[PDB]
Amino acid sequence: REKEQFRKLFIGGLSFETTEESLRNYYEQWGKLTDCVVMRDPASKRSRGFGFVTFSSMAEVDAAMAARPHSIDGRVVEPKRAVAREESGKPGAHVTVKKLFVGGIKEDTEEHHLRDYFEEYGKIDTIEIITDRKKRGFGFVTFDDHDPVDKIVLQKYHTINGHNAEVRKALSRQ
RNA sequence: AGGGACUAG
């Protein structure tokens, strides 16, 4: 079975009334859950206003996300790909951004190479190879929704054109 | 932005 991190959504903006049961119920209309949880405060056991749900496959998750917005107990919720514990610390972890930095591509990799690979994740605005003078070995890609990026950065390394290529949410300066 | 879970630290 696929890694959990690739099958899991963070669900923010929940009602303090929302239970696992109704969370579990609403997200089952796109597949089988293997885990469900409204995070609660240790002492009080009051909701923290977000939870997690885990589907059996990535295909299920995508459909869930194709079917936005979501609404549970009168609140529009904020489903997001679950960012790993490992990661949840640095800037640009929960930055919900639409641009993506792409590195480790070397001089033999072209603007079309990047479309080929990334068009699959969602629709694109723009691509940018970087050079001065031949080619610095990195570039940028810009999607219409944040979710392509979010899906992309669940995996640090993407194999593109014979290279172990590294992806990162694009930060300003900085 | 992590409660449980866990065959790559």
Numbering used by the authors: 15 to 147, 151 to 191
What sentences appear in the manuscript?
As a core component of the hnRNP complex in mammalian cells, hnRNP A2/B1 is an abundant protein and has been implicated in numerous biological processes. The B1 isoform contains an insertion of 12 amino acids (aa) at its N terminus. Both isoforms have an RNA-binding domain (RBD) composed of tandem RRMs separated by a 15-aa linker, and a C-terminal Gly-rich low complexity (LC) region that includes a prion-like domain (PrLD), an RGG box, and a PY-motif containing a M9 nuclear localization signal (PY-NLS). Here, we determined the crystal structures of the tandem RRMs of hnRNP A2/B1 in complex with various RNA substrates, revealing the molecular details of specific target RNA recognition and shedding light on the mechanism for hnRNP A2/B1 in various RNA-mediated biological functions. The two RRM domains in hnRNP A2/B1 interact with each other extensively in a fixed antiparallel orientation, and the binding surfaces of RRM1 and RRM2 align in the same plane, which forces hnRNP A2/B1 to bind two antiparallel RNA strands or a single-stranded RNA with a long connecting loop.
In order to understand the molecular basis for hnRNP A2/B1 recognizing different RNA sequences, we grew the crystals of hnRNP A2/B1 (aa 12–195) in complex with different 10mer RNA mutants. Three complex structures containing RNA mutants A1G, U6G, and A7U were determined at high resolution. For the A1G mutant (5′-A0G1G2G3A4C5U6A7G8C9-3′), the AGG motif is shifted to 5′-end and recognized by RRM1 in a manner almost identical to the wild-type 10mer RNA structure. In addition, the G3 is recognized by the side chains of Arg99 and Glu18 of RRM1 through hydrogen bond formation. Therefore, RRM1 of hnRNP A2/B1 can specifically recognize an AGGG motif as demonstrated in the A1G mutant structure. Additionally, RRM2 recognizes UAG in the same manner as was seen in the structure of wild-type 10mer RNA. Moreover, two hnRNP A2/B1 proteins bound to same RNA strands can adopt various orientations, as seen in the structures of the 10mer RNA and the two 10mer RNA mutants A1G and U6G. These diverse orientations are mainly due to the absence of direct interactions between the RRM domains bound to the same RNA strands.
